[PDB]
Amino acid sequence: MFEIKKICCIGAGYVGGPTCSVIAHMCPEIRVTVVDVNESRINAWNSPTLPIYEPGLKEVVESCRGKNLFFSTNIDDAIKEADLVFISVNTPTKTYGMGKGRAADLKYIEACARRIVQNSNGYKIVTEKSTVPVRAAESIRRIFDANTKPNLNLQVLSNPEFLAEGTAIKDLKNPDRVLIGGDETPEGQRAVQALCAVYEHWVPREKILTTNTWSSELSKLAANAFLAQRISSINSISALCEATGADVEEVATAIGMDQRIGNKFLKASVGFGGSCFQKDVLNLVYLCEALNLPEVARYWQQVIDMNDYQRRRFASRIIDSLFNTVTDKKIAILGFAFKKDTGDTRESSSIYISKYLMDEGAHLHIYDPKVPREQIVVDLSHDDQVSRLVTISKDPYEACDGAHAVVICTEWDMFKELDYERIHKKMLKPAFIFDGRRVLDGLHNELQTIGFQIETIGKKV
Amino acid sequence: FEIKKICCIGAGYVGGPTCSVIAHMCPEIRVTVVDVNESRINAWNSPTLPIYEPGLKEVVESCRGKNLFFSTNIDDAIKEADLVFISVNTPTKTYGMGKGRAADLKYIEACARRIVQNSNGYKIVTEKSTVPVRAAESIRRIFDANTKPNLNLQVLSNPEFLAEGTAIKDLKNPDRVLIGGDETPEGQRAVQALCAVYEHWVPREKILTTNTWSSELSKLAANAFLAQRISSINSISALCEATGADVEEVATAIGMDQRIGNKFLKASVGFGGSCFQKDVLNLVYLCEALNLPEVARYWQQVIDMNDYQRRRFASRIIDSLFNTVTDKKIAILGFAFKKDTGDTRESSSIYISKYLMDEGAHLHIYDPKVPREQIVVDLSHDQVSRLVTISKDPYEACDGAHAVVICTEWDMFKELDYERIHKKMLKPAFIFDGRRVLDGLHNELQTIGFQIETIGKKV
Amino acid sequence: IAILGFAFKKDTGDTRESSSIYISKYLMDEGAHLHIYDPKVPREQIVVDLSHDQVSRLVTISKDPYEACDGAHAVVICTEWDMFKELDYERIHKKMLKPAFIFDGRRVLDGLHNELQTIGFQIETIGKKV
Ligand SMILES: [Cl-]
Ligand SMILES: [Cl-]
Ligand SMILES: [Cl-]
């Protein structure tokens, strides 16, 4: 029945922006308007240089920007005209109050819901695109009901993202699945098929999944938690490997060849990072506590504790190997991003490893090929201590000059290609390499005969 | 170096089927399966085999007499062998340090001492059974301590991965073959020797070589990762019942993520079997012994969540029946730990029943495949006599019952005449679906008059 | 398993709160076949100190030390008897199962370690790294 002709997206983040640009690119007949209260982002989207970098995004936008793709600060008007309204604002973790540091703050979502109902009349479909806590759509439905008007029929849907930061465009153009949640009612089912129809322009019907609203909200959280659990599980095994003589990469491979388990996300590390994994797992844990499910809450909490353990354990090995004193010792930190090929440092294991070593009074020389200098200084403050202990190196070799140890915290490919023959000559002895990402796997016998003592995650010393 | 004669110690469901298959794909190799129990051997030489596996009878009959032999003459079979499979089961300790969690290596130790006594020259000794880590070190130590001139015993790890029920198919086309050996010149030779045997019918891409400790550890972790998947989706199921979400919907959405996959994501009253809990508990103990308490309590969560899932399910029944079940008739449908088997080992039905028995319920149990006497055994320590009745058919069990409890996903339960059952059930009549087998039938059952509750669905 | 010495200290028949009792009892909880020898302690006293059935299956009482080490996996010394130091350990080793262990709980074989090792024993004792 109802066809969606005009689409409004509230929020030009790395979620709402690319998703709608892709929609506009594969649905030339639909007018998609991306809006945001931040005047900074909108003008950037209208620039030859976009505010976020994704491969193939630059092409997608420019193909449509002006025809059926628009970026504006005019939020009110884009809502009035829209058949479908995407809510795509971030839900930051609460920094105070009931649920501090775990629970999601719904303030931006609540504001958007109140902003929508005020600026809209008639029939409109309201779909939450951002990662939200469960029963959030109940909150949106309740605001609409409390603020009803004659001839106002607002439908609330859930359609969460599943795009990996780095392969956004590919993930959107060829998704594993599209998830849509809606009320188990006639009105809701029509609204679902309206959105369902939009994605059918370029997504096969086999790969479009429809659930109720709560199943959809919960699926996004659980999916990220399952992923995080996989990493923490192989990481726990890594510690058991160091104690037995077993090897975690060998074990991971053997496990991953079981089709029922698969071989993705089984690479042990110093610990997972990113703006989603810990945040969503912690949000899940809080949710369970609030719903009197303490057994479930502490089940998933183990994913976080294990990741904290992995990091602390790694730092302690360094300190122990350096005779439990690191005071005034030069230490090279190679790699600061939470994963390779990005400048994002959010929840990076590099931050914590560094901070542990700073609490020992180490002289850290940090190098990262992509991460901006000012970001590192910010991520290590609350100040004075950063001034005393942290030096930021322009090149890897400048950082390993007179160092006691080389610590690799990000799996950058370039670190593998270093002249370790050169590095060793100007390191203090005994010289240590701690590989927290298994990037120097296969080079061990080389490095040892050069004179390095080399230790890594999931391999007995 | 080529392997010509193979001796396997232990004719269990591990060594038996594995060696019969090897003989079928390696006509040049003389495979001799031995066991100290004369009972087992004659069964293997009989038209009726001691264990049932699809296509096993065929594979065996192809080789039995030509290059496949079952004998009680262990000493001679060891003497002749280039490769010796140790394939005896390693039972959980029932007392002492590590009771109820740690593996007992007594049968493995006996085999190791028996080998070295009856062997000379070069031999490869391979552990086939699920063993605790560093077990091969124990075997190596017996060999080293009991050495002879010109004795070169090589120790390998080659664990099984066959699901009891489709063994032969799993063997003919395995996901991977795992071989662990010492990282030494002599050790690598023994590995490539065994590697060569499997190359007769297994592509080299699906043969993985690791050191001995990685191999032992991989078998435990693999089962644990699997068990964790079930416990994770089960934990989600409890969160679904509290939110209005539905666990079958969520499982589907998760499973479509290629990085996660959609296998082992079906919520249940709890997993069972002779491998999952045993291996996870063995893993946890290992971590404790090695001063890894963080890892130990991480994996323990898989067991606690499974225990929680069962207890949670039982409590819902009791609450729904007004927290009194004394002298109430309750039908228990399905006793096996999974559908299409008579195996009751660690079956969730056992615990659910036991919880309900501790409430003084009158349980009428039905299972289409599971033998009557097995149920009586699995429910003892007197209590069984007073409370447990075993029904020949489902309707005999639901005649005058307050509730119908489904604990095994048997396909036949989906097709029952619930109209008939309801008329002779006491009211209010309850159905507790612990396996999601009645998914899609809910609106039907409700209009009949049933209150129906299931795993991972708000009431 | 051979248990050498049952008294709480050497040169007495007193077994009251003897460490031999607990060591033996721990090993009994593992289902071991204990062969216990003590030159002075009366037979009936050992049986009493190891009761509350369990004793019958697992406890054998040797008249001489060598009856206890004949086919044993390990020798455990729980009392600092002077005589244990003077044993023919070359003989003991020949009829022990391998690997053969000596656990010295009283440091009585201090100075004999290199001898016992070259004979073929694995020897462990209180307060010395293995
Ligand atoms: Cl400081
Ligand atoms: Cl024999
Ligand atoms: Cl006992």
The domain locations on chain B are 1-211, 212-243, 244-459
Distance, in Å, from the CA atom of A353 to the CA atom of A369, rounded to the nearest integer, reads 18
Measured CA to CA in angstroms, residue A174 lies from A20, A162, A163, A170 at distances of: 15, 11, 10, 6
Query: Does B97 lie at the interface with C, CB-CB under 8 angstroms?
Result: yes
Q: Which CATH class is domain B1-211?
A: alpha beta
Three-point CA angle B376, B381, B387, nearest 5°: 50
Q: Under an 8 A CB cutoff, do B261 and A265 touch?
A: no
Which tokens belong to C44? 């009936």
Chain C touching partners, 3 or more CB pairs below 8 A: B
Q: Residue B457: name the closest of B119, A185, B443, A282 by CA.
A: B443
Measured CA to CA in angstroms, residue A168 lies from A16, A319, B270 at distances of: 11, 40, 38
3-class state of residue B144 by DSSP = helix
Distance, in Å, from the CA atom of B457 to the CA atom of A189, rounded to the nearest integer, reads 20
B212-243 has which CATH code? 1.20.5.100
How many Cα atoms occupy the beta-carbon half-sphere of B261 within 13 Å?
17
Alpha helices by DSSP H, B184-272: 185-198, 212-243, 247-255
CB neighbours of residue A46 within 10 Å: 14
Which tokens belong to B302? 């898989």
**Considering the domain A1-212, what is its CATH architecture?**
3-Layer(aba) Sandwich (3.40)
Which tokens belong to C98? 């391998």
- Scanning the structure block, which residue is given the tokens 């730990």? B337
Q: Which CATH class is domain A213-244?
A: mainly alpha
H helices, E strands: number in chain A:
18, 14
Question: A69 - beta bridge partners?
Answer: A32, A65
Question: What residue numbers of C does the annotated binding site for NAD(+) cover?
Answer: 16
Residue B97 has its nearest CB partner, among C30, C98, C100, at: C30
Q: Give the max Cα distance, chain C.
A: 42
CB B458 within 8 A of CB B241: yes
Using a CB-CB cut-off of 8 Å, the residues of chain B touching A297 are none
Which tokens belong to A341? 């090929």
Nearest CA in chain B to C27: B96
Determine which helix (DSSP H) or strand (DSSP E) holds A58, and give its type and residue range. Answer: helix A57-64
Distance, in Å, from the CA atom of B376 to the CA atom of C32, rounded to the nearest integer, reads 33
* CA B427 distance to own-chain centroid: 39
- Scanning the structure block, which residue is given the tokens 């029944």? B317
Alpha helices by DSSP H, chain C: 19-28, 43-49, 54-58, 65-68, 89-94, 113-119
3-class state of residue B200 by DSSP = coil
Instruction: Kindly give, in sequence order, each residue whose CB lies less than 8 Å from that of residue B67, ignoring residues fewer than 6 positions away.
Output: B23, B26, B27, B28, B29, B30, B31
Which tokens belong to A97? 């109050």
CB A438 within 8 A of CB A458: yes
CB neighbours of residue B184 within 10 Å: 10
Determine which helix (DSSP H) or strand (DSSP E) holds B115, and give its type and residue range. Answer: helix B106-117
Q: List the single best residue of B95, B139, B148 to mutate versus C (max C Cβ within 10 A).
A: B95
Distance, in Å, from the CA atom of A289 to the CA atom of C63, rounded to the nearest integer, reads 66
Query: Does B204 lie at the interface with A, CB-CB under 8 angstroms?
Result: no
Strands laid side by side in the B451-454 sheet: B388-390, B362-366, B329-333, B403-406, B430-433, B451-454
**A292 dihedral zone (left: phi>0; alpha: psi -120 to 50; beta):** left
Using a CB-CB cut-off of 8 Å, the residues of chain B touching C98 are 142, 145-146
Query: Does B420 lie at the interface with A, CB-CB under 8 angstroms?
Result: no
- Scanning the structure block, which residue is given the tokens 């098929």? A193
Q: How far is the CA of C46 from the centre of ligand 3 (A)?
A: 18
Q: Which CATH class is domain B244-459?
A: alpha beta
Measured CA to CA in angstroms, residue B191 lies from A157, B211, B219, C24 at distances of: 57, 10, 18, 43
Distance, in Å, from the CA atom of A430 to the CA atom of A451, rounded to the nearest integer, reads 8
Q: Which residues precede gaps in chain B, with C-N > 2.5 A?
A: 381
- Residue count of chain A, please give it: 461
Give the number of whichever ligand sits closest to the CA of residue B79. Answer: 2
Instruction: Kindly give, in sequence order, each residue whose CB lies less than 8 Å from that of residue C19, ignoring residues fewer than 6 positions away.
Output: C8, C78, C105
Instruction: Kindly give, in sequence order, each residue whose CB lies less than 8 Å from that of residue B196, ignoring residues fewer than 6 positions away.
Output: B2, B3
Measured CA to CA in angstroms, residue A375 lies from A338, A358, A370 at distances of: 13, 17, 11
Distance, in Å, from the CA atom of A293 to the CA atom of A134, rounded to the nearest integer, reads 14
Q: By what method was this entry solved?
A: X-ray
Q: Under an 8 A CB cutoff, do C30 and B141 touch?
A: no
Instruction: Kindly give, in sequence order, each residue whose CB lies less than 8 Å from that of residue A292, ignoring residues fewer than 6 positions away.
Output: none
Give the number of whichever ligand sits closest to the CA of residue A328. Answer: 1
* CA A108 distance to own-chain centroid: 19
CB C100 within 8 A of CB C93: yes
Q: Which long-range contacts (CB under 8 A, 24 or more apart) does B25-29 make?
A: B25/B200, B25/B201, B26/B67, B26/B197, B26/B200, B27/B66, B27/B67, B28/B4, B28/B67, B29/B3, B29/B4, B29/B5, B29/B67, B29/B197
Topology adopted by domain A245-461: Rossmann fold (3.40.50)
Which tokens belong to A396? 């890897």
- Indicate if B244-459 has the same CATH topology as B1-211: yes
Distance, in Å, from the CA atom of B112 to the CA atom of B143, rounded to the nearest integer, reads 8
Three-point CA angle B243, B244, B249, nearest 5°: 110
- Residue count of chain C, please give it: 130
Query: Does B120 lie at the interface with A, CB-CB under 8 angstroms?
Result: no
Strands B362-366 and B388-390: parallel
- Scanning the structure block, which residue is given the tokens 């775990």? A102
Q: Residue B254: name the closest of A30, A176, A355, A62 by CA.
A: A176
Distance, in Å, from the CA atom of A339 to the CA atom of A153, rounded to the nearest integer, reads 45
Q: Residue B409: name the closest of B429, B382, B437, B367 by CA.
A: B437
Q: Residue B402: name the closest of B367, B439, B361, B366 by CA.
A: B361
Distance, in Å, from the CA atom of A120 to the CA atom of C29, rounded to the nearest integer, reads 77
Active site residue A330: no
Using a CB-CB cut-off of 8 Å, the residues of chain B touching C31 are 95-96
Strands B83-86 and A363-367: unpaired
What is the helix, strand, coil percentage profile of chain A, to 5? 45, 15, 40
Which tokens belong to B164? 């009891």
CB A459 within 8 A of CB A270: no
Distance, in Å, from the CA atom of B350 to the CA atom of B336, rounded to the nearest integer, reads 9
CB neighbours of residue A344 within 10 Å: 18
Instruction: Kindly give, in sequence order, each residue whose CB lies less than 8 Å from that of residue A40, ignoring residues fewer than 6 positions away.
Output: A51
Q: Residue B282: name the closest of B236, B366, B237, B223 by CA.
A: B223
Query: Does B426 lie at the interface with A, CB-CB under 8 angstroms?
Result: no
Entry resolution (Å): 2.7
DSSP letter (8 states) at residue B246: B
CB A22 within 8 A of CB A172: yes
Strands laid side by side in the B83-86 sheet: B68-71, B30-34, B5-9, B83-86, B121-127, B151-157, B177-181, B207-210
Measured CA to CA in angstroms, residue C50 lies from A291, C6, C27, C47 at distances of: 53, 11, 12, 5
**B405 dihedral zone (left: phi>0; alpha: psi -120 to 50; beta):** beta
Distance, in Å, from the CA atom of A228 to the CA atom of A264, rounded to the nearest integer, reads 12
AA letter at C89: Y
Q: Residue A410: name the closest of A334, A307, A351, A345 by CA.
A: A334
Determine which helix (DSSP H) or strand (DSSP E) holds A454, and give its type and residue range. Answer: strand A453-456
- Scanning the structure block, which residue is given the tokens 């309206």? A194
Q: How far is the CA of A386 from the centre of ligand 1 (A)?
A: 10
- Scanning the structure block, which residue is given the tokens 């290992």? B286
Distance, in Å, from the CA atom of A149 to the CA atom of A152, rounded to the nearest integer, reads 5
Q: Under an 8 A CB cutoff, do A179 and B253 touch?
A: yes
Catalytic residue among A112, A276, A400, A409: A276
Q: How far is the CA of A374 from the centre of ligand 1 (A)?
A: 21
Q: How far is the CA of B46 from the centre of ligand 2 (A)?
A: 21
